[PDB]
Amino acid sequence: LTSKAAYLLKRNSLIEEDASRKLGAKIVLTNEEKVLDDFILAEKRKLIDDSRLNQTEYMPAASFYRSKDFIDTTFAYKIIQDMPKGGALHLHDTASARIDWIVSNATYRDHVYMCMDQDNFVRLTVSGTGPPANSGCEWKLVETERANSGDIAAFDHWLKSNISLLTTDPLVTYPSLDKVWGRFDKHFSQLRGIIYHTPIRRDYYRQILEEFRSDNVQYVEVRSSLSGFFELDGTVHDAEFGLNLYKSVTEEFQREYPDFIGAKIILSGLRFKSQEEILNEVKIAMDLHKKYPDFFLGYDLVGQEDPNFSLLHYLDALLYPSIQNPPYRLPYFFHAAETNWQETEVDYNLADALLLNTTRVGHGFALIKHPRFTELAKENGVAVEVNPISNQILGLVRDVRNHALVPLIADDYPIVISSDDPGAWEASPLSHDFYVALMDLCGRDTALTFLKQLALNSIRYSAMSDTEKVAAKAKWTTQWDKFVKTSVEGLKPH
């Protein structure tokens, strides 16, 4: 009737037309699921409106250092903690478990040594033939140092404080992409000596499995170098040994916990190695994918993407599987366009990843800046592994609401949410990144369809076979319905 009423009808048409395109709009919720969705929506909308109208800071989009405790004090984070989120498809094996486990378990073992390097960073290693040979760092046995500390708890807390990235605010202590990446590489060099010892590495991978299961994540796809596992006698094993160790741990864990879906491993090489070495690693990946077709997925090039070699620089090595007669199909999981640049060597790695038939693309922070690349990656079914906390800390974004992949989420783009390296910055396996996605990557009228669609895409866009995908969806559905029923009974009066 009224021109105002006709305008409002057209407004509802347009707004529904726009808001139905977000990822997860296809989700239909049962009444109990709607109860949980309303529970989450109330808190999220209260926070959004309090920040917007009272003109106060929106903590969910703040630095994870400052917002971590705040997140830990919200009811919705408890809901997400109890929620089974499916799979974490983008992880690195050396920083996916608590640093506290390394401090309280690994550095308590025999022959574990420490030393303060030239940069005032603690380094931990394992050497069975007495103190290790090094003059650039004065090595002291950790047992004697802990005994001499007097206060053992303070010593362990300091040991975690000199290793963790969250001891101070990374956005302040390392206020540049270069500085924070230097701190990240320093963290890895600190943990390299001790974490590559074979027993400690096996127990650390076991801890990765346990911690991700406890956070109600049932499936993982872990990137690992797989080689360099050493013993007290000095023996250094090849990548196949590491793959077999991971496989045995995973099979034992699956035997213990039937609710767990499992784990699969991707081989990661470095973006600054010689093309000869990268070709050697590609050949190793081909052999391991042949010999272990169900557990070994493929190959990936990791390391800081801006200052190191491009995908094209390794092109020969990456084309070696395809030039065979018959051609061999080696899957890829490229980190691509993890950069703030445009039309450079870094973000144009997206073209290489798409042309090399990559299974998934890590980050894709510059993907939105390339229209045809986005279209082609969506058409081919290449999902994007978005790691919001990783992208904030490692210098890509500062306000998480300004993340580059938010519009792609709002237009139903194939995406999964993962943590990259959770342990380095003291983050939960997937619930903290899920909370960040819920509070920063979707609109005010989006609470639970988004999270359930992320949980579904973590299985759909995994590397599992179709039969494995169906079985994994069955297990995840069992856990999800159990969680929904328990939460609703815990919140709904009777």
Ligand X SMILES: OC[C@H]1O[C@@H](n2cnc3c2N=CNC[C@H]3O)C[C@@H]1O
Ligand Y SMILES: *[C@@H]1O[C@H](CO)[C@@H](O[C@@H]2O[C@H](CO)[C@@H](O[C@@H]3O[C@H](CO[C@H]4O[C@H](CO)[C@@H](O)[C@H](O)[C@@H]4O)[C@@H](O)[C@H](O)[C@@H]3O)[C@H](O)[C@H]2NC(C)=O)[C@H](O)[C@H]1NC(C)=O
Active site residues: 338, 363
32 forms part of the interface with ligand NAG (CB under 6 A): no
Nearest approach, Cβ of 180 to ligand NAG (angstroms)? 12
| 335 versus 475: smaller Cβ distance to ligand X | 335
Structure tokens at 278: 């990268």
Helix and strand tally (H, E) in the chain? 20, 11
Sole window of 268-276, 278-286, 350-358, 425-433 interacting with a second copy (rule: CB under 8 A): 350-358
Instruction: Report the relative pairing of strands 140-141 and 112-116 from DSSP bridges.
Output: antiparallel
Q: How many CB atoms lie within 10 A of CB 428?
A: 24
Site for ligand X, rule CB under 6 A = 92, 94, 185, 188, 225, 268, 302-303, 335, 338, 362, 390, 420-421
Q: Is 92 annotated as a binding residue?
A: yes
Rule CB under 6 A: say whether 75 interacts with ligand NAG: no
Task: Give min distance, CB of 49 to a second copy, in A.
Answer: 8
CB of 336 to a second copy, least distance (A): 14
Q: Residue 335, annotated ligand binder?
A: yes
Alpha helices in 54-119 (DSSP H): 64-72, 75-82, 99-104
Distance CA 263, CA 399 (A): 33
How far apart (Å, rounded) are the C-alpha atoms in residues 354 and 364? 12
- Pick from 224, 358, 418, 446 the residue near a second copy by CB under 8 A: 446
Q: What are phi and psi of 146, to 5 degrees?
A: -65, -40
Non-local CB neighbours of 338 within 8 Å, separated by 6+ positions: 305, 306, 346, 362, 363, 364, 365, 391, 394, 396
421 binds, among ligand Y, ligand X, ligand NAG, none (CB under 5 to 8 A by kind): ligand X
Residue 359: how many CB atoms within 10 A of its CB?
21
Question: In terms of Cα–Cα distance, which of 257, 180, 262 is closest to 220?
Answer: 262
Q: Give the x-and-dash track for 156-175 against ligand NAG (CB under 6 A).
A: -----xx----x--------
* Residue nearer to Zn ion on the CB measure, 271 or 473: 271
| Closer of 47 and 226 to Zn ion (Cβ) | 226
Q: Does 345 bind ligand NAG (CB under 6 A)?
A: no
Tell me the closest approach of the beta carbon of residue 122 to ligand NAG, in angstroms: 6
Who's near 162: CB < 8 A, 6+ residues apart? 121, 122, 190
d(CA 284, CA 115): 34
Find the helix or strand (DSSP H, E) in which 244 lies: helix 239-256
If one asks whether residue 357 binds ligand Y (CB under 6 A), the answer comes out as: yes
**Residues 214, 342, 357, 380: which binds a second copy (CB under 8 A)?**
342
Among 322, 342, 465, 486, binds ligand Y (CB under 6 A): 322
Q: Is the distance from CB of 400 to CB of 369 less than 8 angstroms?
A: no
Is 420 marked within a binding site?
Answer: yes
Residue 197 labeled ligand binder: no
Name the segment binding ligand NAG (CB under 6 A); options: 133-141, 144-152, 253-261, 353-361.
353-361
CB 294 within 8 A of CB 336: no
When CB distances to ligand Y are compared, the closest residue is: 357
Distance CA 193, CA 73 (A): 36
Please identify which residue in the block is written with the tokens 């916990």.
257
Q: Cβ neighbours of residue 237 under 8 Å, at least 6 residues apart? A: 198, 227, 228, 229, 230
Number of residues that bind ligand NAG (CB under 6 A): 20
Least distance in angstroms from the C-beta of 354 to ligand Y: 9
Q: From the CB of 123, what's the least distance to ligand X, in Å?
A: 14
The DSSP line for 22-66 is: STTTT----HHHHHHHHHHHHHHHHHHHHHHHTT---GGGS-HHH
Q: Minimum distance from CB of 302 to Zn ion (Å)?
A: 6
Residue whose CB is less far from ligand Y, 158 or 320: 320
Which CB atom, from 74 or from 94, has the smaller least distance to ligand X? 94
By CB under 5 A, name the binding residues for Zn ion. 420
Beta carbons of 301 and 334 less than 8 angstroms apart: yes
Work out whether 327 is an interface residue with ligand Y (CB under 6 A). yes
Residue ranges that bind ligand Y, judged by CB under 6 A: 322, 327, 356-357
**Annotation: binding site for Zn(2+):** 90, 92, 335, 420
Chain residues that interact with ligand NAG, rule: CB under 6 A = 46, 49-50, 53-54, 105, 108-109, 120-121, 161-162, 167, 203, 206-207, 322, 355-357
Indicate the annotated binding residues for substrate: 93, 303, 421
